[PDB]
Design a protein around this nucleic acid. Structure first.
Length: 118
RNA sequence: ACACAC
């Protein structure tokens, strides 16, 4: 088991305020709204995106590392449906999106100019 | 199941 230490534990050498969201049971259409509904109480979300390239996944970005730490520690193993759409969460390696519009699979919670690009 | 989701 990993001992808690700075510069070694996941929470002290891999934190970039960005997280990856893996869906275990995509029996329903996942959207940026439901991901925001569970991520917003964990902190002020800034961006959300969804992709299907290798399965079913989503991404989230926070205004602070502290919001990403409690989101990754509370929403992990949680479910969107309260019976299905189970989650897994970990720190992401990229650090910024290049969002171009807002819709059910892509969104930006601070740039209003992408709302008309739908 | 790691953003570039058209």
């Amino acid at each position: 088991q990993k001992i808690s230490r700075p510069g070694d534990s996941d929470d002290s050498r891999s934190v970039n305020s960005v997280l990856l969201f893996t869906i275990l049971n995509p029996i329903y259409s996942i959207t940026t709204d439901v991901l925001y509904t569970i991520c917003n109480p964990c902190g002020p979300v800034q961006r959300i995106v969804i992709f299907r390239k290798n399965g079913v996944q989503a991404m989230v970005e926070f205004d602070s590392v502290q919001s990403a730490q409690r989101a990754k520690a509370s929403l992990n193993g949680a479910d969107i449906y309260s019976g299905c759409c189970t989650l897994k969460i970990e720190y992401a390696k990229p650090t910024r999106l290049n969002v171009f519009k807002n819709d059910q699979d892509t969104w930006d919670y601070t740039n209003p100019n992408l709302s008309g690009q739908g």
